Structures are given as structure tokens and as C-alpha cells.
């Protein structure tokens, strides 16, 4: 009967002190966590953060909410969550988190006859993971989401992953634009602060960047302009207008590429592999123009000897530099 | 016992007037501040501010909340903060702040048997600090956070850093890609005005901008283009097309770099060291083109003497200008 369930619920809620956690004087309450990732909507290197969306479930035994005579698992409206005790769970590295409120506050309370309580939310977090761009765009990040209890110590509360490694789901279905989730790992620790030893859980994704964006219009055009400088070695030793225009226009193209790619890159004032590669190419075309300068000055003070030496050397030196760069950053 | 703790807490709450501070007629209540810095999210020069995230703890002794018979330190829900008096603290230099509400409004209350009250928050503030940028990107900034009391003077309240220099922690956790915190300083002030003495606390970071990115892209291309003008000296005095194309294309490249740096650097309509250096390089390439024009006019209306003079002078003048700039901005 509906009235029977109504009086049972009122009996459970009446005299319920939300402030006191379950087993206040007793041992710590064990809260089993669970996550179902819906998507990773964004991964920005500008702010070193990524947006995650997830169904976040928390299971805990609360003997005060045990009821008998109703074999069904009661599913109450979200507002009942205001009148009960829930863990003070929070994420350390979040920058701006919120619970979705589309037509209702997206929460679920599911009681059980044995006092077990399921509290689920739909949370969109903007987590912060620091990224090293030393090997960018050949990098591999380790972005993590960490979960802790803000107030209660390990003596008061206890966290664990519900179902072991199977707790977190939906990672496989994720399809990032410029990343690939190589692996996800779950960890449980106790973190000692000045106040006391708190519990912690951690969910870490190892994201490997996909190199399809960075070989076809970043390295390829710089390489080909370097080839055109090599062509500048091949023209002549007296056609001053042609060689000078070719060299300086190649320099101009490299400067244009560098400026527009820096405008394209996500504004991280730090040295990166692409930056050293492009500066190497720029220095190479600059050295080609200097080589023509030396040839012209020496003749108009052997020009053919220096031109042939440059023809032999510059391709070899650039190939050596490219091999060194590729092996160093791989 | 559940009932014993419940009735103890109920006894504490009743008879408690939140409007009245502890020892309302008595001496001022001493409040111990404490901060644990999680991270500095960003430091924006366009708005001259920085976003900080921290755990902000305040300790104060309240005899109305003292309890006996429970040797444990009671940790209650964040909602209990509604029913207790707390200091009217605020950050004087701020633009936007909030307390994280990820599944709970992030607060912790931890009553102690001797009446001591711990009030912890997790605050993501956006503090405003002045930023001189005459020496940009070689600038060295001093940003501050100014904690203060709104209504109370020293007679009613009093602030102090807890542990002295140990009050603020987590400075090592700060990872700014383009800055390095040289030091942090804590200053407690008791600023005496005619009406009364108002307390204040100041947490001041001394940031220094690393030059491993700005130097490379900002100065190496410009220096190399100036060296290409230097190449333009050595070509000839009758190869008109080659020298003219080289000089004017170097001018075009310098303009391109300047405009794209304007579009790249974060929009400070202000005179800076980088602007002075870029205009110096632009003026140098401009003078190279001008003296070639003089050479052409003299030759077609000695030319070699002017070319030798330029070869001797321009590298020396540019080295002198560079040395003066570096010594003046260091």
C-alpha cells in the first residue's frame, strides 16, 4: 500500500540527524565508489585541463535507513538526498564542476531493505592535469582524476572501488579527436595531511597523441622549403637576382609558417620539439643564403668549389640533423 | 553512543546566537589563518590578475561550543556551518571567487573538546595584482592576496598567521609554465586608523618570468633577418635586382614578424622592451636598404668605399645596440 510506504519513509526520516555520519562512534563507514564515464568532451593544452562527464555512484551502508516489510528497493526522488547524510566526496584537481540540472537535479537515491544506500549523480568536471610539452607533438600524457573526502579522516570514512578494476566503465567507447586512451588505471591510497590521514582514489588515463596532424602540414612544408633552399644551391653562381630572390623568399615562407603555427599552437610559453625543428629548418635556409653570400663575395673580391661542397654537405647535414631529432624525440 | 553524541550536539546548538561573536563583551577573538595552495590556474596580463585555488582554514576558540565526555574531535557536516558564527573574512583584492560545490558545498567544521573551532573552505579566487611591463618579457612581478575583516576592528576581532612562516603551504605544488615563484612572504599588519585599528594579512608571491620561449621566437628570427640585411651588404653594388629584393623582403619579413607578434602576445597596448628591440631591428634593416639606395645613386650618377664602411659599421653598431639593450633591461 502507498500509505504503508509513506509511513515507513516518514519513520525512517523522523529523528534522523544528518550531521552525524553512520557509526559515529563506531568504525569508519566504507563507501564504495563507482564511475561510468560518458565522454571526455575536451582536452585543452592551453589550460592543461580536460572536461569529463560521468555517472558517479556511491554505495554505503546506513543502518538508520533500514526498513522491513517492503521487499522492493525504494527509489525516492532526488530531493530526499537533502534530508539524508551523504559523503563529502570531492575532486582535488577539478577547476569547475557541476551537477546537471536538466528538468531535475540529476541525482538518484536508491534505498535497500538492509540499509544499503546508493547515491548517484551526473557530474561534468573540468579536471586539471599538468602536461609536459618537451616531446610535443610526440608526447604521452598521464591525466588523472582524484577523489577524496574533504572533512572526514580515514578513521571516520573509508573509500574503495566497487568491483575492482571493473568499477570504471565506458573508457573504451571514448573517441578523442587528437588522442588515444592507451590505458586506464585505478588506485587507492591514504594521504597524510597535517589534519590527518584522508582516503583517496585515483583514476589515471594514459593518453598517447596521434601523429597525423603534425607530419603532413608542419614538418612536410618546412622540409620542402628546405629542399627549395637546396635547389637554390643548384641554380648557378652568377644569376644573382634568381638565387637571392629564391633564398629570401624561402626565408619569408619559413617566417610565415612559424608565425602562423605559433598562432595555431595553444599558447604555452615553453620550448617544444616542433619549435626546435622549425628553428633548425629556419637556420638551414638562413645558412643557405649565407653560403650564397660567401660564394658571391669570394668570386667578386672558388665559387664552383664552394657551390659543389654545399651541394654535397647541406643535404647530408640536414639528413643527419633530422635523424638526430627523430631518434632523440622517439 | 549515537544518542549521547546527538544530545551533546543538540545541547551545543541550543543557546547559541550566531549574531554574537565569541566573547561578545570580552577581549577580541583571535583567529588563526592558514592556507594550502593547490595551484595557480593562470596569470593574465590583459586583466592584470591571477587565479588561485586553495584550502583556507580558520581556527578560533569558542567556549559556547565546548563539550566534555567525548575525547574525540567531532567532525560534522558542512551544513553545520550555517548554524555557527564564523569570521566575516574577505579578500580585499579580488574580482571573482567561489567555494567548490562538487557533490557538497566544500567546507569542513571540526569542533574540539576545548571549544576550538576549525573552519576550512576550498576557494578558487581571482585576485587582482598590478603588473608593470616596462621590462616585459624580462619583467619581475609581485602579486599579493590581502585577507581582511569586513566589519570588525582589532577590538572585536584579531587575525594572525598560524605557525608563522609555516602558515602557507603548497608553494612547491605551483607549476606555472611561464613563471617561477622566487619567494613567498607573509605579512601581518594591524593598520591603525583614527576610528580604530583594523587587522590584515598579506600573502605575497614574487614571480619571475622564465626566458626560454620569449627569447627564442621573439629575438632569433629578428637577429637572423638583420644578419640577412648584413648579407645584403656583401652582394655587390650593380646587382640591383638582387640587393633590392633582399632588402625589401627583409623589411617585409620584419613587418610580418612584428604584426604576428602583436597578434600573438597578450594584447598589452603599452611600450615594452620587446617593442623597442623589434623597432631597433626594423630600423637597422631600413638603414641597410637606405644606404644601398645611396650607393646606387652615387654609382649611377666611391660606391666600394661606402660598402666597406657599411660592412665595418653595421655589425659593430648592432652589437653595441644589443649590448646596450641587454644591460639596460637586466
Amino acid at each position: 500500500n502507498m500509505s504503508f510506504v509513506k509511513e515507513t519513509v516518514d519513520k525512517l526520516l523522523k529523528g534522523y540527524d544528518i550531521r552525524l555520519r553512520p557509526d559515529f562512534g563506531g568504525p569508519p563507514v566504507c563507501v564504495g565508489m563507482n564511475i561510468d564515464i560518458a565522454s571526455i568532451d575536451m582536452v585543452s593544452e592551453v589550460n592543461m585541463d580536460y572536461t569529463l562527464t560521468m555517472y558517479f555512484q556511491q554505495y554505503w551502508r546506513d543502518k538508520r535507513l533500514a526498513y522491513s516489510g517492503i521487499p522492493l528497493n525504494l527509489t525516492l526522488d532526488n530531493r530526499v538526498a537533502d534530508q539524508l547524510w551523504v559523503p563529502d566526496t570531492y575532486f582535488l584537481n577539478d577547476k569547475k564542476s557541476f551537477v546537471h540540472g536538466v528538468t531535475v537535479k540529476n541525482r538518484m537515491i536508491r534505498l535497500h531493505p538492509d540499509g544499503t544506500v546508493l547515491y548517484g549523480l551526473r557530474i561534468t568536471t573540468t579536471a586539471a592535469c599538468m602536461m609536459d610539452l618537451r616531446r610535443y607533438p610526440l608526447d604521452e600524457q598521464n591525466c588523472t582524476l582524484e577523489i577524496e573526502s574533504y572533512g572526514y579522516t580515514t578513521d571516520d570514512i573509508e573509500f574503495y572501488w566497487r568491483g575492482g578494476d571493473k568499477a570504471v566503465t565506458g573508457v573504451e567507447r571514448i573517441e578523442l579527436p587528437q588522442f588515444s586512451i592507451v590505458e586506464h588505471r585505478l588506485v587507492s591510497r591514504n594521504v597524510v595531511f597535517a589534519t590527518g590521514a584522508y582516503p583517496r582514489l585515483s583514476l589515471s588515463f594514459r593518453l598517447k597523441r596521434n601523429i597525423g596532424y603534425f607530419i603532413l602540414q608542419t614538418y612536410m612544408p618546412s622540409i620542402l622549403i628546405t629542399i627549395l633552399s637546396w635547389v637554390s644551391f643548384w641554380i648557378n653562381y652568377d644569376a644573382s637576382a634568381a638565387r637571392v630572390a629564391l633564398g629570401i623568399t624561402t626565408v619569408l615562407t619559413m617566417t610565415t609558417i612559424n608565425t602562423h603555427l605559433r598562432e595555431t599552437l595553444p599558447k604555452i610559453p615553453y620550448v617544444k620539439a616542433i619549435d626546435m625543428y622549425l628553428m633548425g629548418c629556419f637556420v638551414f635556409v638562413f645558412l643557405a643564403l649565407l653560403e650564397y653570400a660567401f660564394v658571391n663575395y669570394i668570386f667578386f673580391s672558388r665559387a664552383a668549389a664552394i657551390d659543389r661542397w654545399s651541394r654535397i654537405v647541406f643535404p647530408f647535414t640536414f639528413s643527419l640533423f633530422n635523424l638526430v631529432y627523430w631518434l632523440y624525440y622517439v | 553512543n549515537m544518542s549521547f553524541v546527538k544530545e551533546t550536539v543538540d545541547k551545543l546548538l541550543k543557546g547559541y546566537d550566531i549574531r554574537l561573536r565569541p566573547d561578545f563583551g570580552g577581549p577580541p577573538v583571535c583567529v588563526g589563518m592558514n592556507i594550502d595552495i593547490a595551484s595557480i590556474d593562470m596569470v593574465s596580463e590583459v586583466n592584470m590578475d591571477y587565479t588561485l585555488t586553495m584550502y583556507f582554514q580558520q581556527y578560533w576558540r569558542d567556549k559556547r561550543l565546548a563539550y566534555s565526555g567525548i575525547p574525540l574531535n567531532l567532525t560534522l557536516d558542512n551544513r553545520v556551518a550555517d548554524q555557527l558564527w564564523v569570521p566575516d573574512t574577505y579578500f580585499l583584492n579580488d574580482k571573482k571567487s567561489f567555494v567548490h560545490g562538487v557533490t557538497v558545498k566544500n567546507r569542513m567544521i571540526r569542533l574540539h573538546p576545548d571549544g576550538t573551532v576549525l573552519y576550512g573552505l576550498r576557494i578558487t579566487t581571482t585576485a587582482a595584482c598590478m603588473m608593470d611591463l616596462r621590462r616585459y618579457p624580462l619583467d619581475e612581478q609581485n602579486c599579493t592576496l590581502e585577507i581582511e575583516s569586513y566589519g570588525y576592528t582589532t577590538d572585536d576581532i584579531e587575525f594572525y598567521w598560524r605557525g608563522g612562516d609555516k602558515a602557507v603551504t603548497g608553494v612547491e605544488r605551483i607549476e606555472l609554465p611561464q613563471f617561477s615563484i622566487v619567494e613567498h612572504r607573509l605579512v601581518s599588519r594591524n593598520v591603525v586608523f583614527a576610528t580604530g585599528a583594523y587587522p590584515r594579512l598579506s600573502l605575497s608571491f614574487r614571480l619571475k618570468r622564465n626566458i626560454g620561449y620569449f627569447i627564442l621566437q621573439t629575438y632569433m628570427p629578428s637577429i637572423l633577418i638583420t644578419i640577412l640585411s648584413w648579407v645584403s651588404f656583401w652582394i655587390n653594388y650593380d646587382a640591383s635586382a638582387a640587393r633590392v629584393a633582399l632588402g625589401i623582403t627583409t623589411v617585409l619579413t620584419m613587418t610580418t614578424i612584428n604584426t604576428h607578434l602583436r597578434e600573438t602576445l597578450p594584447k598589452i597596448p603599452y611600450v615594452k622592451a620587446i617593442d623597442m628591440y623589434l623597432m631597433g631591428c626594423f630600423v637597422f634593416v631600413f638603414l641597410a636598404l637606405l644606404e644601398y639606395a645611396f650607393v646606387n645613386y652615387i654609382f649611377f650618377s666611391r660606391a666600394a668605399a661606402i660598402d666597406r664602411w657599411s660592412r665595418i659599421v653595421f655589425p659593430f653598431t648592432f652589437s653595441l645596440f644589443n649590448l646596450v639593450y641587454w644591460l639596460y633591461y637586466v
Partner: nanobody, 105 residues
Framework: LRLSCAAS????????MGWFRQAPGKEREFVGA????????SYADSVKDRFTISRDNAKNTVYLEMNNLKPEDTAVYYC??????????????????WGQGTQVT
């Protein structure tokens, strides 16, 4: 005296570096802290202005140097690494990867 500690592997995941002293009686007691990036340092009160830390990323090595030794300092030292969200610095349990004890008189 001089005592350096070189690291390897995924150093970026463990930016913070700690120097612990394990006495015969009491456990790993104080912390000489240093960040890999920026060289920001933090010392215990007892070891201020006498033990100092530097770093060099050309070989990824920190350098703790002892100055003005007293006889009570005879003990074994550990070099440990700590992550970006491991909590407080002055607690050995927050540190993950421990090194071999170096005994010094």
C-alpha cells in the same frame, strides 16, 4: 659532505623530491624538499642554513650538501620522489619510490 641523487623513468609524474633521515630510534624524521622544475626548496627548521639543496636537469640529479656537521647527525639518508597530488611534504607515507640508505657519520 656532499650527497647527490639522480632519477630516471617518468620523472615528470613525480616532480617533488624529498630527503629523509632515518635515525636508529625514531623513524624517517625530517624532510629536505626540492622541486624538479624551478628549483624551489623547503627545509626543516633544524637543517636551515646548514644543509642546502640544488638541482641540475642536464643529468636529472639533485645535490644535497651538508655543512657544519654535528656528531648527532650520524644516521642513514633516503632520497624519495613524490607526485603532484600526494598531499603534505613532511610525511614519508606520501612518498612512493624510495632509494637505498646512505649511511653518513
Amino acid at each position: 659532505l656532499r650527497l647527490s641523487c639522480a632519477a630516471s623513468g617518468h620523472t615528470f609524474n613525480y616532480p617533488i623530491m624529498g630527503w629523509f633521515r632515518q635515525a636508529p630510534g625514531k623513524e624517517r624524521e625530517f624532510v629536505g624538499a626540492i622541486s624538479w622544475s624551478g628549483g624551489s626548496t623547503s627545509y626543516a627548521d633544524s637543517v636551515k642554513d646548514r644543509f642546502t639543496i640544488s638541482r641540475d636537469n642536464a643529468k636529472n640529479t639533485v645535490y644535497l650538501e651538508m655543512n657544519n656537521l654535528k656528531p648527532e647527525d650520524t644516521a642513514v639518508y633516503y632520497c624519495a620522489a613524490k607526485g603532484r597530488y600526494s598531499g603534505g611534504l613532511y610525511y614519508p607515507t606520501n612518498y612512493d619510490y624510495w632509494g637505498q640508505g646512505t649511511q653518513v657519520t
